Design an enzyme around this catalytic site. Structure first.
Site, PDB file in Angstrom:
ATOM      1  N   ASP A   1       0.826  -1.211   0.000  1.00  0.00           N
ATOM      2  CA  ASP A   1       0.000   0.000   0.000  1.00  0.00           C
ATOM      3  C   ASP A   1       0.864   1.266   0.000  1.00  0.00           C
ATOM      4  O   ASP A   1       0.826   2.094   0.921  1.00  0.00           O
ATOM      5  CB  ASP A   1      -0.971  -0.011   1.183  1.00  0.00           C
ATOM      6  CG  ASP A   1      -1.993   1.108   1.111  1.00  0.00           C
ATOM      7  OD1 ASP A   1      -3.030   0.919   0.429  1.00  0.00           O
ATOM      8  OD2 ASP A   1      -1.749   2.162   1.752  1.00  0.00           O
TER       9      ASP A   1
ATOM     10  N   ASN B   1      -8.677  -9.685  -3.404  1.00  0.00           N
ATOM     11  CA  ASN B   1      -9.743  -8.685  -3.364  1.00  0.00           C
ATOM     12  C   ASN B   1     -11.119  -9.332  -3.356  1.00  0.00           C
ATOM     13  O   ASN B   1     -12.028  -8.930  -4.086  1.00  0.00           O
ATOM     14  CB  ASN B   1      -9.598  -7.673  -4.500  1.00  0.00           C
ATOM     15  CG  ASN B   1      -9.072  -6.343  -3.996  1.00  0.00           C
ATOM     16  OD1 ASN B   1      -9.566  -5.824  -3.005  1.00  0.00           O
ATOM     17  ND2 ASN B   1      -8.050  -5.806  -4.650  1.00  0.00           N
TER      18      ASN B   1
ATOM     19  N   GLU C   1       0.352  -3.538  -4.465  1.00  0.00           N
ATOM     20  CA  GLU C   1       0.012  -2.119  -4.258  1.00  0.00           C
ATOM     21  C   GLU C   1       1.257  -1.331  -4.056  1.00  0.00           C
ATOM     22  O   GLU C   1       1.397  -0.641  -3.108  1.00  0.00           O
ATOM     23  CB  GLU C   1      -1.025  -1.816  -3.174  1.00  0.00           C
ATOM     24  CG  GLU C   1      -2.463  -1.738  -3.662  1.00  0.00           C
ATOM     25  CD  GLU C   1      -3.380  -0.885  -2.819  1.00  0.00           C
ATOM     26  OE1 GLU C   1      -4.220  -1.372  -2.051  1.00  0.00           O
ATOM     27  OE2 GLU C   1      -3.295   0.315  -2.938  1.00  0.00           O
TER      28      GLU C   1
END
Ligand SMILES: [Ca+2]
Ligand code: NA
Length: 276
Positions: free
Chosen positions: A28, A170, A54
């Site tokens: 992230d 996801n 990410e």
DNA sequence: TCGACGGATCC
DNA sequence: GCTGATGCGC
DNA sequence: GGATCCGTCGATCGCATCAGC
């Protein structure tokens, strides 16, 4: 309630010691997480192969620490075509792979930098960051397209070597994979669609949810918490980060771990142990 | 995710 | 560099 | 007619980019 990951079983179901330690982390922001002492946590966990998602980092903005990372000399990276700062995955490993590819062989799906394939002697490793159906389900229709094409790319691979798929997929597979199943049955990552796509990937390829194979009835085991609403502290979260492997590999499965304590992202890292 | 919001409906 | 603003994520 | 039920529906947090100078 809170969750405690049990000790690492480093022995195979047949008593062999583990040989390969794969570790996956949706980071992230590769730059934020490095700044957040993430690579520290990598240095101590000491994986053989490290997969990251990410990344949100350009090929030229990657901090210098990464190349200097010891034990993970072979470093492969994919970032999107024309969306600077979106998506991005990497794969670093102690040993060098035999062939490395990018994407799943489909123009529509290989433009956002989400898939790395790393072929080794005894198996093939795939790491991916899957598209989120979106806030407001704006991209749920496209996520049905991706799931179908990713499904058949893996069915392909699987026919030729033992497959191990890891990363952020996801979707929470079942009501046991997230703290608020009723509150989220039509938001991103828990729709009837996404969940049928996960089960179809499991029956079609075929693959086993490594973690659930071992702990098929242990709840509150999560890998992601929203930064908002101090949710990680309350342990309200989602299991979105899997190791999926071919049934062929289950005698080699020693343990599938969730590193709840490791900080640096909104995802925590996960770690796979194999006797190969 | 969380509350503030409805609007339904229950005694 | 520094400020605004917007995009994308569960 | 007061108090509960239960579906929306904005906005917290964080990591990026982009426009402009
Ligand atoms: Ca948007
Ligand atoms: Na009564």
């Amino acid at each position: 309630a809170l969750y405690e990951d049990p000790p690492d079983q480093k022995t195979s179901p047949s008593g062999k010691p583990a040989t390969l330690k794969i570790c996956s982390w949706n980071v992230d922001g590769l730059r934020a997480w490095i700044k957040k002492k993430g690579l520290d946590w990598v240095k101590e966990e000491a994986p053989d192969i490290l997969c990251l998602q990410e990344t949100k980092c350009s090929e030229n903005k990657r901090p210098a620490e990464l190349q200097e990372l010891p034990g993970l000399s072979h470093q492969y990276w994919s970032a999107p075509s024309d969306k600077e700062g979106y998506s991005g995955v990497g794969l670093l490993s102690r040993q060098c792979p035999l062939k490395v590819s990018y994407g799943i062989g489909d123009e529509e799906h290989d433009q956002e930098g989400r898939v790395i394939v790393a072929e080794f002697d005894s198996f093939v490793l795939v790491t991916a960051y899957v598209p989120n159906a979106g806030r407001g389900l704006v991209r749920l229709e496209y996520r049905q397209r991706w799931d179908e094409a990713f499904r058949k790319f893996l069915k392909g691979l699987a026919s030729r070597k033992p497959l191990v798929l890891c990363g952020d997929l996801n979707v929470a597979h079942e009501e046991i994979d997230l703290r608020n199943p009723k509150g989220n049955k039509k938001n991103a990552g828990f729709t009837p669609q996404e969940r049928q796509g996960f089960g179809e990937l499991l029956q079609a390829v075929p693959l086993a949810d490594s973690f659930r194979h071992l702990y098929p009835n242990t709840p509150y085991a999560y890998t992601f918490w929203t930064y908002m609403m101090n949710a990680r502290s309350k342990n309200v979260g989602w299991r979105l980060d899997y190791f999926l492997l071919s049934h062929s590999l289950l005698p080699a499965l020693c343990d599938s771990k969730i590193r709840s304590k490791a900080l640096g992202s909104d995802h925590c890292p996960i770690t796979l142990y194999l006797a190969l």
